[model samples]
Target chain A: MLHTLHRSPWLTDFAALLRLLSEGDELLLLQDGVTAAVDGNRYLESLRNAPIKVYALNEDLIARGLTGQISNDIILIDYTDFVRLTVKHPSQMAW
Target chain B: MLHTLHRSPWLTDFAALLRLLSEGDELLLLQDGVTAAVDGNRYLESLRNAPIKVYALNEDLIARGLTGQISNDIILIDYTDFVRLTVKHPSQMAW
Candidate 1:
């Protein structure tokens, strides 16, 4: 599954998102969602053991001033890379 | 783009999101997503250019008391029907 959350994880239900994620799923963060990139955030702590990969939009990271703070678990992505995030799931949300 | 949205059109900037829409894209409205069905909402106007299809869950339409008030452009359906669109587009993500 490709789960994309484009707002702050706190605004949305970050806990449920982590619980629902599976091994093959990918998380794409953009917009205010980039705020979760900081190291030592609880979500990142929970994600470390999971096989899922996290991807953040580069523009969003810089816009939110998280460019230097994001944890290494998150793979920075460009607009084109996350462009592929929009299609899929007729969407079941944790929010 | 057979995607599902659960947020109200207002919070999500449905117009800007429409730019990502392609011809023949399918939108499944669930949860708070039915809010977009209000008569003559501007978000639907932005979507008029493409051959976009909009569907709202019947439960949400009536539960929110906007059933008859919703525009003619929106199609109302139940859970089983919603499942079909989900099945139809495996690539469909919840946006």
Candidate 2:
């Protein structure tokens, strides 16, 4: 599964995504969605060690001045890499 | 001003952002927001020659199989460039 999230965690209910997610799912955070990637954020804690893979846009992180501030386990990818994920995954959903 | 939009244009009101916008504003489209960037989309039409600049996330377009489908006038940018946008703008808001 490929899930694209772009809303700020504060203004959105991430639990909706958590409920639909299962093992082997992927979450790509962009726009304000990168806020949940910050260190000490509860959203990051909820995703820690979960079965799903977590990815955040490196540009969003940098734009928000969050470089080196995201969870260590989160994978950061560029635009071309993001395209690859969509092609690799059989399903794509946006939020 | 920097405005980040993440929802599909069908589900969200771009006009709300437009009403608040002024000259020199920037709109960054991501996630489902990329839908509005499609060529011939009415939302894109509404933004044509508007006071603000418009950008679409390249990855979002690719993920949705919309590469080369966006309006020619809409600027496509990677995540790093997205960071640059925020830095260049004095104020930022996300929807």
Candidate 3:
């Protein structure tokens, strides 16, 4: 499923969002969601053990001046890839 | 669907949540979500135009010192009523 998260962890149940992802589901972190790419964000560290592939919008991090703070494990993408994800996933259930 | 939002509208697309609801669906606002009951909150005012029923946890409002700030149109419920809602709606999706 195409899962898009546009809010910060403080406003979202990041753990529950991650728990809902299936093996091949794509998780897109845009806008405020890009904030989680930093260190000490509690729920996202579990992504290390999960099988799902996660991504963050690199442009958003740049807008927020946080591109320098993002950790290496998080795959960063551009707007073109975000559009590709909408086509890649068959259906979406936004949480 | 039993849609529960534990975060504030600041962290959520409250408009999207209202738009996703079916006529019979129940929307539960708990924890920080109760903050939307205030007069100046933006997205929740659209609830007046939507058909689905909405509920906010009174305990959460009181804990946040916002019970006095909530508008009259929003239904306020206690924990017992909240439990009853879980039984009323067959399935739930926390947003």
Candidate 4:
């Protein structure tokens, strides 16, 4: 599954995403959801332990002052990568 | 401000919520956002520390099997209460 998370991890939709997430699912954090990549945030911890691949939008992270401070596990990508992820996983969910 | 959260908190919309939220602002979690109210969730922890008043739709909670597992800090309301919240706050944002 390919999911675009544009909200903070504090909303229930994050949990919903987790419940439905399968192994090897791709999660791309953009807009406000980029905060999840912050090094010590609870959301980052959750993502680190989650059984899926995680990615963060480079611009969003920088906009939020999270550049270089994000968890190492999360792959950083630009818009091109975003498009590529969408194509790679035809099934996508946005929240 | 009155915020109607329809998506999960994992979306950046929830972060935008905290940025615009002022003291005593009301947050009504409906749809999938109700999942944030479940006990022991990281999202619930964040909401508890937030300065806003949080509410969850009773029906939505029940539908998600979260009837009695939600945090007590979050008020449970019906549709009628939902309407009341909108009227109480002149400003509203939906996510």
> In the order shown, what is each candidate's alpha-carbon RMSD?
14.6, 13.2, 15.0, 6.5
CA lDDT scores, all candidates in order: 0.75, 0.85, 0.80, 0.84
Q: Between prediction 3 and prediction 4, which has the larger TM-score?
A: 4
DockQ, 0 to 1 scale, candidate 2: 0.03
Best prediction by lDDT:
2
Assess the local accuracy of residue A16 in candidate 3 as a C-alpha lDDT between 0 and 100.
69
Cα lDDT of model 1 by residue, B1-95, tens digit: 58788987656645456766777678888889888777887666755555788889999887888888877888888999988887787568575
What candidate 3 gets wrong by more than 4 Å, as runs, is: A1-95
Q: Model 1, A22: alpha-carbon shift in Å?
A: 48
Steric clash count of candidate 2: 2
TM-scores of the models, in the order given: 0.50, 0.50, 0.52, 0.55
**Candidate 2's residue-wise lDDT over A9-92, tens digit each?**
655655667787889889999999998889898668877856888999998998989988988888999889899999999999
Measured over the true interface residues after superposition, the C-alpha RMSD of each candidate is 6.4, 6.5, 4.8, 3.2
lDDT of 4 by residue, A1-95 (tens): 79889976765356677787789888999998888888888777777778899999999988888898988899999999999999899799887
DockQ of each: 0.03, 0.03, 0.23, 0.30
Residue B67, candidate 3: alpha-carbon lDDT: 80
Worst 10 residues of 3 chain A by lDDT: A39-48
lDDT of 3 by residue, B1-95 (tens): 78898987766756567778888887888998888777667756777567777788999988988888877778999999999999988898897
